[PDB]
């Protein structure tokens, strides 16, 4: 029955990290009295922890923003290729945002070029699409949410070559349509472009805030 | 104000993993933007990253087990110093409401018919059991409906005969 106790605390650790927060510590032993033939176990902890503060912000790598708008599908130093069997090109741009404190630069191509036809303001024959899938009940949490589906005058895209093989290095290009056409179709319910319909959503549940729900 | 600093934000659950300790300001704990903080063990673990929307949660169970209902899912703006897309503070949420359909009908019930004749007594000596059954088909139940009560009453009968 010998009562053990703590000895002297050792040297404190220096702050491990060069940015932000870290943790320093001190180590003590139960070496001077020592519990012999039983007793207790020195009463407490052989380890203290402490937070150290370097007060300097940390590297954060930049992240890509979303891609911009596609450029028009025209040719440089020419005119336009609207409503014509001429494949062109168009470009798109990104922006690296958020890079601070010697962080890593954004990895990848900041530009994007793809091949295109042009149906910008092109009068195209059209046909009414079938009923779209029912949308979301809007407004969520607001008074009387309603869904919405719609039929729209879908243009008949012209039967062009979707794959255009260029020479030089024999590069074949997946060509996709660009532009807002002018779809021509017969009226359905007094409307030429889009006729929709709304229906109210049944048995709407109340929105309860998850931090207000846990508490 | 001091705060509990943690070393890792789980993001899959929104929990504060790996406690660095406490008694330290939020600006210093969020210099390392991979860290996270919360006040005590009450909850709401917020990462030290710039504020970004989390993942959309799973859809809530449909408000009724029948016909067209409605179901919710949430998304929480998590981060520190800044705003999410749409003038949203860190901690505010966004909901999506969708019409669900677990099943189609919901049970209307049927009515009983006329009682069947009493069955003979279950034994020929001393005392037994007299059963009386009916059917649930006046009108018949549709989908998941059922008639209220029981379809077979059971009483006792005395045959007045010794074994």
């Amino acid at each position: 029955g010998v009562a053990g106790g703590w000895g002297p605390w050792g040297p404190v650790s220096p702050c491990p990290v060069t940015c932000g927060l870290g943790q320093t510590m001190e180590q003590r032993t139960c070496n001077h009295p020592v519990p012999q033939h039983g007793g207790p176990f020195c009463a407490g902890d052989a380890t203290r922890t402490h937070i150290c503060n370097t007060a300097v912000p940390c590297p954060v790598d930049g992240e890509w923003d979303s891609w911009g708008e596609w450029s028009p599908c025209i040719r440089r130093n020419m005119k336009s290729i609207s409503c014509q069997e001429i494949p062109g090109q168009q470009s798109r741009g990104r922006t690296c945002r958020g890079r601070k404190f010697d962080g890593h630069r954004c990895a990848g191509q900041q530009q994007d070029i793809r091949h295109c036809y042009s149906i910008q303001h092109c009068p195209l024959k059209g046909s009414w699409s079938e009923w779209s899938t029912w949308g979301l009940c809007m407004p969520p949490c607001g008074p009387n949410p309603t869904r919405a589906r719609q039929r729209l005058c879908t243009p008949l895209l012209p039967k062009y070559p979707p794959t255009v093989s260029m020479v030089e290095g024999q590069g074949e290009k997946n060509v996709t349509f660009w532009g807002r056409p002018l779809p021509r179709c017969e009226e359905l319910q007094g409307q030429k472009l889009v006729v929709e319909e709304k229906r109210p959503c049944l048995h709407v549940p109340a929105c309860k805030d998850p931090e207000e729900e846990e508490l | 104000d001091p705060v509990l600093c943690f070393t890792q934000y789980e993001e899959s659950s929104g929990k504060c993993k790996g406690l660095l300790g406490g008694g330290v300001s939020v600006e210093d704990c969020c210099l390392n933007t991979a860290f996270a903080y919360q006040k005590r063990s009450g909850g709401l673990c917020q990462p030290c990253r710039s504020p970004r929307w989390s993942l959309w949660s799973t859809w809530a169970p449909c408000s009724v087990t029948c016909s067209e209902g409605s179901q919710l899912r949430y998304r929480r703006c998590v981060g520190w110093n800044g705003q999410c897309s749409g003038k949203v503070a860190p901690g505010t949420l966004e909901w999506q409401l969708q019409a669900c359909e677990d099943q189609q009908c919901c049970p209307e019930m049927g009515g009983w018919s006329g009682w069947g004749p009493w069955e003979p007594c279950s034994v020929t000596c001393s005392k037994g059991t007299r059963t009386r059954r009916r059917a649930c088909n006046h009108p018949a139940p549709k989908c998941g409906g059922h008639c209220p009560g029981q379809a077979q009453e059971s009483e006792a009968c005395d045959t007045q005969q010794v074994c």
Partner: nanobody
Amino acid sequence: QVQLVESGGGLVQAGGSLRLSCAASERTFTIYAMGWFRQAPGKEREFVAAISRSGENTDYADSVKGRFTISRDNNKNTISLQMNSLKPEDTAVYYCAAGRAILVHTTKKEYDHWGQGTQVTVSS
């Protein structure tokens, strides 16, 4: 930054015991979480044991759990690996490793500082 020196290896019979020690740089010792690795002939390097900066939290590989014990002496800038019931499959070059840990109770499996190694050979 930090240098690591292993010691205590040698030739042991099967079932015997061996105690390795790893000396690290004195001024930066309590900053780094530390551990033991080994690389057998013809095999990749594999995790053996880890210890936090505290010496209070340990982690072990399943192949050595119950036989090996990692300890830390924060008075004398050393860690130790007490290897009991040694088998011929434990023959490897044993490496001491050091890794930066933000918390003092965190055990690591990824390390960016490595010693030159100590040879342990177990004969049957």
